[PDB]
Amino acid sequence: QPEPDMITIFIGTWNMGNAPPPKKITSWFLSKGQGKTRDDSADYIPHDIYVIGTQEDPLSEKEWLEILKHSLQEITSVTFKTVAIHTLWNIRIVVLAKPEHENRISHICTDNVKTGIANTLGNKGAVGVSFMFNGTSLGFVNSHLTSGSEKKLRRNQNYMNILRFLALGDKKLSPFNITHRFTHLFWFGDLNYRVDLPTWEAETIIQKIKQQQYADLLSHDQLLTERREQKVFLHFEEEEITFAPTYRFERLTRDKYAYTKQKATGMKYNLPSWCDRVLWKSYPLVHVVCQSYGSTSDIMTSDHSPVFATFEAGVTSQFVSKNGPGTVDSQGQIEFLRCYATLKTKSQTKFYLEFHSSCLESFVKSQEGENEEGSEGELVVKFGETLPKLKPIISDPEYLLDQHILISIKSSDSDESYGEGCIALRLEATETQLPIYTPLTHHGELTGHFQGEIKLQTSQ
Ligand SMILES: CC(=O)Nc1ccncc1C
């Protein structure tokens, strides 16, 4: 039974509008409807992992699990295993996997974050799940962010609170938030970003949707515009949107957008919007390909339509050598030349680096760097040829070239991280000096850069 090199992952997000689902929801799991849809020839082929995020979910965990599992069994004739389920209020995440994967999946974590204070604490936030699939770490976040067209800044703040405070993955990676803990991170939900056009343009927008002409709407989508301005979701990818806005529909049809202000909306307009989204972030030079991204047309219980996305994702095996795990492999080493951090900080403390990777027995602290002033005001922290030589547990290039080094630059004064990034060991050559680079972030905002050269020695 060979271990897989690649799996497929289904991501679903649905704001159920506090209504039970209809009797058949199979179109969701088949990626059928509008947008980038899955080929009919794949209908009976199960995805390896199904991750279902709901918002405004009125069902008990048991009720929803029975619907999901019976849906997948009808499609695939496979009885899926429940990996995890976690609910905060009416925000839920379910992870299901093919039974063959049960003994490939370990280190399952769940968490939630509640967003806002007082007034604004009580129904918005996120749930998430992480686990290891053989040698690959996977994270999944379902968030229901603040509603309303004039609250994009609140949504961005909700995003920053969720990635700071959601405690998933390896707790030993203490300087790193969820945006650095996983080989593949999927972030989805009712993110509630709107099409920011004048209220008076509602019927014009509906016309454009009927013509399947999305370009002049997407140019005003708040998630795309905020992400282009580095206000939210920095370093996350999204597949091009080619499906109609998924909100706000009259229930029991899809023929009508319900946009006008009502007492039930707090006298707010809900112009047609792409509230319901799937984004991802994978470590550099790991295979990840979006195969589908769309919405269903035939599930009409809610004022939102379900959204699906599917991915091919590279995975690695749980590697054992004669040496590591349990010792180092002296045939392996990672060296750093001409390295320096450029930081945006106005502060003047000394900095050191920490190197974290599951290819090391434990994280490695460098000596302090030498601070200089950049020509445009910046702090440059020079490590020159001073960084430690990293001793991987396994030297086999089929293992080592698939690994990644997380880097934190920390203040000597406070031991607080000022920036985090990631370097792939998937190099063009071994025993050769090659440029490396990562942006540095802190709380998912850009704080600087790390660049230099690497020299990787493997057993080959
Ligand atoms: C066009 C655009 O917004 N790109 C982007 C922004 C932030 N982070 C990642 C990406 C790929």
Same domain membership, residue 381 and residue 239: no
Same domain membership, residue 347 and residue 239: no
Task: Give 225 Cα–ligand 1 centroid separation in angstroms.
Answer: 9
* Closest by CA position to 407, among listed 331, 336, 338: 336
Q: Is the CB of 235 under 6 A from ligand 1?
A: yes
Task: Report the atom number in ligand 1 closest to the C-alpha of 224.
Answer: 3
Task: Report the atom number in ligand 1 closest to the C-alpha of 228.
Answer: 3
DSSP character string of 363-395: -EEEEEPEEEE-TTS-EEEEEET-SPPB--S--
CA dist 262 and 81 (Å) reads 43
Domain final position from 306, 325, 344 = 325
Residue 354's Cα: distance from chain center in Å?
24
* Closest by CA position to 422, among listed 440, 398, 409, 448: 440
- Within 10 angstroms of residue 119's Cβ, the number of other Cβ atoms is 6
Same domain membership, residue 330 and residue 314: no
Q: Is the CB of 445 under 6 A from ligand 1?
A: no
- Asked how this structure was determined, the answer is X-ray
Taking CA atoms only, the protein residue closest to ligand 1 atom 2 is 228
Taking CA atoms only, the protein residue closest to ligand 1 atom 7 is 234
Task: Give 71 Cα–ligand 1 centroid separation in angstroms.
Answer: 35
Task: Let me know: does 299 contact 22? Beta carbons within 8 Å.
Answer: yes
Domain final position from 325, 358, 376 = 325
3-class secondary structure, 277:
strand
Same domain membership, residue 170 and residue 223: yes
Same domain membership, residue 344 and residue 287: no
CA dist 214 and 19 (Å) reads 29
Domain that holds residue 404: 326-460
Domain final position from 260, 290, 325 = 325
Task: Give 235 Cα–ligand 1 centroid separation in angstroms.
Answer: 6
Q: Which resolution in angstroms does this entry have?
A: 1.4
Same domain membership, residue 250 and residue 280: yes
Same domain membership, residue 318 and residue 371: no
Same domain membership, residue 320 and residue 342: no
Task: Let me know: does 80 contact 73? Beta carbons within 8 Å.
Answer: yes
Task: Give 143 Cα–ligand 1 centroid separation in angstroms.
Answer: 20
Same domain membership, residue 236 and residue 343: no
Counting the structural domains of the chain, the total is: 2
Same domain membership, residue 157 and residue 58: yes
Going by DSSP bridges, is the β-strand pair 49-55/6-15 parallel, antiparallel, or unpaired? parallel
Q: Is the CB of 229 under 6 A from ligand 1?
A: no
CA dist 168 and 376 (Å) reads 38
Same domain membership, residue 436 and residue 300: no
Same domain membership, residue 360 and residue 310: no
CA dist 348 and 442 (Å) reads 17
